[PDB]
């Protein structure tokens, strides 16, 4: 390509080019206002149009990195605003771009983006659509410097669709608020998955990453030969390793190359991928990454005639240990798309341990003969956990399920603070409501994918303020042991009940004023504080106190007196509760 910027403009398109340039300059320049980024985007777009008109212009033949670095260094306020980032302008390429990458401030110091009223949002969307959508996109980009730009563009398109849909109805709030909350949760989950995968590739290792990719791609592509799966795994591992470095252009190029290979080798990968290969380059890899699992062949036999029964198994293992292990992992993942990736990894680790232990001794057939029975409990452990919690979800709604989870996880570990406990338990209740609505053939992957980010958030909260050692021990282990370590937690017999605080168990007239959500937050906080002050409370006593509280607040809001009902009857309720427990 003579002009790389002209190729980018012709492939992506004018609107996509402007959006991506804005997102990139906001991820790099985070303290400049919106108008400066708008002017920079307009100048870059005009230059790209001049390059498209003639490929032999003044500065059209130079690379994208040099043009981007020059546009970054043309900022007159760069030094006085950034300090260190301005020193990268003295470097050459690719040292200058690497220096700019090292200075991407993650989690900067900016005020949080408050959500305005639905009426104000719709009014601003109608009066000026572009300068509103792009303004919010610039804010989100400057607040998330390492977020993948095409994903941010996809989320922005979804937000624009939601705004166009809801602002044209009678009740705009009842339409917009659920969509806004769902989009916020999805964006948080996407960022959490990205950062977690990068941290796992850094800490755990390429071997664990390749095992995870083998399991995933074998579950997604069961009709593929193991050689194709292994090549795809190596390519995807390289792609993720290059994307975790931070260079957006090289990450996009690697993803595009992988998507091109997949769309060219469709005939040897899957059959449910024809739709994604017709989309442009911006959406091709995004569609491929979120494709359904292909149907497996029906004539697939058991894994007994190739891993336990037939001979030459120890020979194939000693000739290539990790190759045979990945072969077994792929052959096991292709059979069970309903299993979680961590479960298949545990099975592979167990098989590896059994082979390593019972191959340096004579007559190894008798050792691994009864080795598939060891897979029975490990498979039944999550299955028994799922179709019991949904059972509880069948007995109690999402709110009561979250309350029961709060009680349980406060009895198990009371050292954790109240707001973090409440947030994690509400997230767990949402996860249960989301994944229990699926049949038993898709519950485990949903639960795994959601519990991953839930426990990740729990531990990024726990690391900044460590309280209990057991919580830090559950995350300092392997990713296949986080959920087992957390489920192995029991009630804390070493915990001492904190002294009674009458100020915490006080309610006022504003409780009836708060919305349907904040009132639940306050009730859950009160429940957590009650469980923490009285941990030895049984189920009957807790249920009785909860019923007394429910009858107390319901007899004060819809009554005659407003203020002299919470401090009057509440003084009796707290004493009645302190009598028991
Ligand atoms: O296996 Al090989 O540590 Mo070839 O060796 O993890 O480090 Mo190539 O990547 O991977 O391209 Mo690396 O160049 O490098 O388990 Mo570890 O069977 O016996 O080795 Mo095995 O010929 O065909 O390491 Mo046979 O390619 O290594 O596995 O023992 O490949 O044999 O394999
Ligand atoms: C529908 C499908 C999706 C379902 C998802 C269900 C729940 C949603 C999952 C995401 C949780 C998450 O991921 N939450 C963060 C995000 O961020 Al944030 O541990 Mo991250 O130490 O900082 O105000 Mo980003 O505080 O202490 O709690 Mo905002 O949490 O509101 O730390 Mo808010 O770097 O930090 O993560 Mo606290 O890992 O970069 O703006 Mo640790 O920071 O948006 O809010 O960014 O990190 C984490 O990405 O806050 C919270
Ligand atoms: C999640 C990343 C979104 C990036 C695109 C933002 C488009 C406009 C969003 C407006 C709403 C922001 C979130 C909210 O306040 O609920
Ligand atoms: C096709 C890739 C072959 C090389 C990678 C093999 C990885 C085998 C891992 C077996 C399970 C160990 C536990 C784990 O990886 O988390
Ligand atoms: C200054 C030039 C800025 C160019 C911005 C280009 C952003 C990358 C677009 C990549 C589109 C495809 C993404 C993918 O395939 O994963
Ligand atoms: C998240 C609230 C509880 C309801 C769902 C419980 C799911 C438990 C099993 C999780 C699936 C993955 C198991 C594993 O990590 O191997
Ligand atoms: C401070 C603790 C907050 C909640 C911690 C939850 C830990 C993960 C739980 C995963 C599901 C376990 C279900 C169960 O306990 O049977
Ligand atoms: C310790 C004396 C006061 C205890 C009051 C109960 C603590 C809050 C429990 C909330 C249960 C009801 C929840 C609801 O229905 O909204």
Swiss-Prot record:
<feature type="binding site">
    <location>
        <position position="65"/>
    </location>
    <ligand>
        <name>Zn(2+)</name>
    </ligand>
</feature>
<keyword id="KW-0479">Metal-binding</keyword>
<feature type="domain" description="Albumin 1">
    <location>
        <begin position="1"/>
        <end position="184"/>
    </location>
</feature>
<feature type="site" description="Not glycated">
    <location>
        <position position="104"/>
    </location>
</feature>
<feature type="modified residue" description="Phosphoserine">
    <location>
        <position position="487"/>
    </location>
</feature>
<dbReference type="Pfam" id="PF00273">
    <property type="entry name" value="Serum_albumin"/>
</dbReference>
<feature type="disulfide bond">
    <location>
        <begin position="276"/>
        <end position="287"/>
    </location>
</feature>
<dbReference type="GO" id="GO:0005615">
    <property type="term" value="C:extracellular space"/>
</dbReference>
<feature type="site" description="Not glycated">
    <location>
        <position position="536"/>
    </location>
</feature>
<keyword id="KW-1015">Disulfide bond</keyword>
<feature type="modified residue" description="Phosphothreonine; by FAM20C">
    <location>
        <position position="81"/>
    </location>
</feature>
<dbReference type="GO" id="GO:0140272">
    <property type="term" value="F:exogenous protein binding"/>
</dbReference>
<feature type="glycosylation site" description="N-linked (Glc) (glycation) lysine">
    <location>
        <position position="279"/>
    </location>
</feature>
<dbReference type="GO" id="GO:0030170">
    <property type="term" value="F:pyridoxal phosphate binding"/>
</dbReference>
<feature type="glycosylation site" description="N-linked (Glc) (glycation) lysine; in vitro">
    <location>
        <position position="197"/>
    </location>
</feature>
<feature type="site" description="Not glycated">
    <location>
        <position position="193"/>
    </location>
</feature>
<keyword id="KW-0225">Disease variant</keyword>
<dbReference type="GO" id="GO:0031093">
    <property type="term" value="C:platelet alpha granule lumen"/>
</dbReference>
<dbReference type="GO" id="GO:0016209">
    <property type="term" value="F:antioxidant activity"/>
</dbReference>
<feature type="site" description="Not glycated">
    <location>
        <position position="260"/>
    </location>
</feature>
<keyword id="KW-0677">Repeat</keyword>
<feature type="binding site">
    <location>
        <position position="11"/>
    </location>
    <ligand>
        <name>Ca(2+) 2</name>
    </ligand>
</feature>
<feature type="glycosylation site" description="N-linked (Glc) (glycation) lysine; in vitro">
    <location>
        <position position="376"/>
    </location>
</feature>
<feature type="glycosylation site" description="N-linked (Glc) (glycation) lysine; in vitro">
    <location>
        <position position="534"/>
    </location>
</feature>
<feature type="site" description="Not glycated">
    <location>
        <position position="357"/>
    </location>
</feature>
<comment type="function">
    <text>Binds water, Ca(2+), Na(+), K(+), fatty acids, hormones, bilirubin and drugs. Its main function is the regulation of the colloidal osmotic pressure of blood. Major zinc transporter in plasma, typically binds about 80% of all plasma zinc. Major calcium and magnesium transporter in plasma, binds approximately 45% of circulating calcium and magnesium in plasma. Potentially has more than two calcium-binding sites and might additionally bind calcium in a non-specific manner.</text>
</comment>
<feature type="binding site">
    <location>
        <position position="245"/>
    </location>
    <ligand>
        <name>Zn(2+)</name>
    </ligand>
</feature>
<feature type="disulfide bond">
    <location>
        <begin position="435"/>
        <end position="446"/>
    </location>
</feature>
<feature type="binding site">
    <location>
        <position position="250"/>
    </location>
    <ligand>
        <name>Ca(2+) 1</name>
    </ligand>
</feature>
<feature type="modified residue" description="Phosphoserine; by FAM20C">
    <location>
        <position position="3"/>
    </location>
</feature>
<feature type="site" description="Not glycated">
    <location>
        <position position="539"/>
    </location>
</feature>
<feature type="modified residue" description="N6-succinyllysine">
    <location>
        <position position="562"/>
    </location>
</feature>
<feature type="site" description="Not glycated">
    <location>
        <position position="210"/>
    </location>
</feature>
<dbReference type="GO" id="GO:0005783">
    <property type="term" value="C:endoplasmic reticulum"/>
</dbReference>
<feature type="binding site">
    <location>
        <position position="247"/>
    </location>
    <ligand>
        <name>Ca(2+) 1</name>
    </ligand>
</feature>
<feature type="site" description="Not glycated">
    <location>
        <position position="562"/>
    </location>
</feature>
<feature type="disulfide bond">
    <location>
        <begin position="122"/>
        <end position="167"/>
    </location>
</feature>
<dbReference type="GO" id="GO:0005507">
    <property type="term" value="F:copper ion binding"/>
</dbReference>
<feature type="binding site">
    <location>
        <position position="242"/>
    </location>
    <ligand>
        <name>Ca(2+) 1</name>
    </ligand>
</feature>
<feature type="site" description="Not glycated">
    <location>
        <position position="2"/>
    </location>
</feature>
<feature type="site" description="Not glycated">
    <location>
        <position position="188"/>
    </location>
</feature>
<feature type="site" description="Not glycated">
    <location>
        <position position="522"/>
    </location>
</feature>
């Amino acid at each position: 390509h003579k002009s790389e910027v002209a190729h980018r403009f012709k492939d992506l398109g004018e609107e996509n080019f402007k959006a991506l340039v804005l997102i990139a300059f906001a991820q790099y320049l985070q303290q400049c206002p919106f108008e400066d980024h708008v002017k920079l985007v307009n100048e870059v777009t005009e230059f790209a149009k001049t390059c498209v008109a003639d490929e032999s212009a003044e500065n059209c033949d130079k690379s994208l990195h040099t043009l981007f670095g020059d546009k970054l260094c043309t900022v007159a306020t760069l030094r006085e605003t950034y300090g260190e980032m301005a020193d990268c302008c003295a470097k050459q390429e690719p040292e200058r771009n690497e220096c700019f990458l090292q200075h991407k401030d993650d989690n900067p110091n900016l005020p949080r983006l408050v959500r305005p009223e639905v009426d104000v949002m719709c009014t601003a969307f109608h009066d000026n659509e572009e300068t509103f959508l792009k303004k919010y996109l610039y804010e989100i980009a400057r607040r998330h410097p390492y977020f993948y730009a095409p994903e941010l563009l996809f989320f922005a398109k979804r937000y624009k669709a939601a705004f166009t849909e809801c602002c044209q109805a009678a009740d705009k709030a009842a339409c917009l608020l659920p969509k806004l909350d769902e989009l916020r949760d999805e964006g948080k989950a996407s960022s959490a998955k990205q950062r977690l995968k990068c941290a796992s590739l850094q800490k755990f290792g390429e071997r664990a990453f390749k095992a995870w990719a083998v399991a995933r791609l074998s579950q997604r592509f069961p009709k593929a030969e193991f050689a194709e799966v292994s090549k795809l795994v190596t390519d995807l591992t390289k792609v993720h390793t290059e994307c975790c470095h931070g260079d957006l252009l090289e990450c996009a190029d690697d993803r595009a190359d992988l998507a091109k290979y997949i769309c060219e080798n469709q005939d040897s990968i899957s059959s449910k991928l024809k739709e994604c290969c017709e989309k442009p380059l911006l959406e091709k890899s995004h569609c491929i990454a979120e494709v359904e699992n292909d149907e497996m062949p029906a004539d697939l036999p058991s894994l007994a005639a190739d891993f336990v029964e037939s001979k030459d198994v120890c020979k194939n293992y000693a000739e290539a240990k990790d190759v045979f292990l990945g072969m077994f992992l792929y052959e096991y993942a292709r059979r069970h798309p309903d299993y979680s990736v961590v479960l298949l990894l545990r099975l592979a680790k167990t098989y590896e341990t059994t082979l390593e232990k019972c191959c340096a001794a004579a007559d190894p057939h008798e050792c691994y003969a009864k080795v598939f029975d060891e897979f029975k409990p490990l498979v039944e452990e999550p299955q028994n956990l799922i179709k019991q919690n949904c059972e509880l979800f069948e007995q109690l709604g999402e709110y009561k399920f979250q309350n029961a989870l709060l009680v349980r996880y406060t009895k198990k570990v009371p050292q954790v603070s109240t707001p973090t406990l409440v947030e994690v338990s509400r997230n767990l209740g949402k996860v249960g409501s989301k994944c229990c609505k699926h049949p038993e053939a898709k519950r485990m992957p949903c639960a795994e994918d959601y519990l991953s980010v839930v426990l990740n958030q729990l531990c990024v909260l726990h690391e900044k303020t460590p309280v209990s050692d057991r919580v830090t021990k559950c995350c300092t282990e392997s990713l296949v042991n986080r959920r087992p370590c957390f489920s192995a937690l029991e009630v804390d017999e070493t915990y001492v009940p904190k002294e009674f605080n009458a100020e915490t168990f006080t309610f006022h007239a504003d409780i009836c004023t708060l919305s349907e959500k904040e009132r639940q937050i306050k009730k859950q906080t009160a429940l957590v504080e009650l469980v923490k002050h009285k941990p030895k409370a049984t189920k009957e006593q807790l249920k009785a106190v909860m019923d007394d509280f429910a009858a107390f607040v319901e007899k004060c809001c819809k009554a005659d007196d407003k203020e002299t009902c919470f401090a009057e009857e509440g003084k009796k309720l707290v004493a009645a509760s302190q009598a028991a427990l």
